[PDB]
Amino acid sequence: GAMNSSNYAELFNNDIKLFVDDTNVYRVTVHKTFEGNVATKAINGCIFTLNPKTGHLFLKIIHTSVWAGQKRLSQLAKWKTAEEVSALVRSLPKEEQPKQIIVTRKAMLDPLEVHMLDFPNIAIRPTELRLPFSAAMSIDKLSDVVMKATEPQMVLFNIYDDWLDRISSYTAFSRLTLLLRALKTNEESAKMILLSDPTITIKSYHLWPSFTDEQWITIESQMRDLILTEYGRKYNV
């Protein structure tokens, strides 16, 4: 069944599950040609596959070469996403394979389901949530590795840094979606909030700053304030 605010806490139980977001798989810039027509130019993209309980992130980099000579690329992107997700599951030891895969966009259901026919016992599920994972490429180190790649490549991260050493996955996930929501709604101001202070740095093996518990509280409040301000602006409310 579909995932919504009701069954939200199932994410943090001990059934292994993954979120798959495909929003950044096929990325283009639009430009004008010499004759004055419009043309797209693709850039590197990535599949965002995330265990919300543990924070393991399986970032599959999608090199522009995969689009070479293909038609209907936005549709193909959904199938490539499913091909790659299926291959990740196949590469995992049985005890690590997910019991459920939750797609952030319903258009991924049919392609993933066809690719996962070998795993009849993995439930492929949509969600009603409006998860901000499109904003992953506003995370500098994730954007960096994607744009530098010269070949298809899988890069692993823990998207929660070391937070779980101190907070629950429920809390970690809420912080993460708050942060990404902020980045999505106003990237400049969100990034200003996170980095304004030069004396709070990012560990080489981390993606976010090493805030203390008290400093996370200030940040989360500053992100909240940002989100609501932008909402008033959007809807003149």
Partner: protein, 300 residues
């Protein structure tokens, strides 16, 4: 011409024979149906005045035996039975005709409707979908479920339609996932036609039987089968040109014969809009498209 006599008509019932029907009153002197065209399968079907629920009936072929109808008051329904004594049977039929207690299969000579709806339907294939080998005729009713339905309970009373599933290993070759899902040609031509049905006439005959069971008995799983078999063709980019032309004809007569008041439950909007407007075959069903637009534009 052949005859299906009735022993009696103890209860009020609407009787159907192929696309025709007649009301018969409780204990009305009614002793069967005559002038039934040899050469086609036929279906004789029933709806009790007292129970608009359950339509039921019997598929048969007059070349396979002498068949008659007899009400069973224990089971409470009209049953088809075979008379093996050819003499006794000519004697009953002749006497009832002499006494003119039989309705005449009312065929207008211009009309090929029933031929068009049953062209590819064979009694031998019917008896494989409705498995009951002690009889030469097949019972179907409104509630019978299909094999594919049972997988999602009593197998003796099931409709063993050929199972079609677009998201199954059978339909999808490993490594051609995207190609085979979007272009079902492999599934149609290699798996189903070459593999299972052997030729397009068996495929068409199961398609047609499925429709007729949905139409005459409101059998839901038959309607599902009919739609699936249409979808498989329309969603295939590569279909023999003879099948497309024959499919256009098949569907045209099915749409033409459907009761107008049943268009809402008997026609799946999604399948028809995809067949006629989205699919590879959007431009290949000219007659079906024309009758669907002029008769059911709402549905589209």
């Amino acid at each position: 011409m052949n005859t299906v006599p009735f022993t009696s008509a103890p209860i009020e019932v609407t009787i159907g024979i192929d696309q025709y029907s007649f009301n018969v009153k409780e204990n009305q002197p009614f002793h069967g149906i005559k002038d039934i065209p040899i050469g086609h399968v036929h279906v004789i079907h029933f709806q009790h005045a007292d129970n608009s629920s359950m339509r039921y009936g019997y598929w048969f072929d007059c070349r396979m035996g002498n068949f008659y109808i007899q009400y069973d008051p224990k089971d409470g329904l009209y049953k088809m039975m075979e008379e093996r004594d050819g003499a006794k049977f000519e004697n009953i039929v002749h006497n009832f005709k002499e006494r003119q207690m039989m309705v005449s299969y009312p065929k207008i000579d211009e009309d090929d409707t029933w031929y068009n709806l049953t062209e590819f339907v064979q009694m031998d294939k019917i008896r494989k979908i409705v498995r009951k080998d002690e009889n030469q005729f097949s019972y179907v009713d409104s509630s019978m479920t299909t094999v594919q339905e049972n997988e999602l309970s009593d197998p003796a009373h099931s409709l063993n339609y050929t199972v079609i599933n677009f998201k199954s290993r059978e339909a999808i070759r490993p490594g051609h996932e995207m190609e085979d899902f979007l272009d079902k040609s492999y599934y149609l031509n290699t798996v189903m036609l070459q593999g299972i049905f052997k030729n397009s006439s068996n495929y068409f005959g199961e398609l047609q039987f499925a429709f007729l069971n949905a139409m005459f008995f409101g059998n839901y799983g038959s309607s599902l089968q009919w739609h699936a078999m249409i979808e498989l063709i329309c969603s295939s980019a590569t279909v023999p040109k003879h099948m497309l032309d024959k499919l256009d004809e098949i569907l045209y007569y099915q749409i033409k014969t459907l009761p107008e008041q049943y268009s809402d439950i008997l026609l799946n909007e999604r399948v028809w809009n995809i067949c006629l407007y989205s699919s590879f075959q959007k431009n290949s069903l000219h007659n079906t498209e024309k009758i669907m637009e002029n008769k059911y534009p709402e549905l589209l």
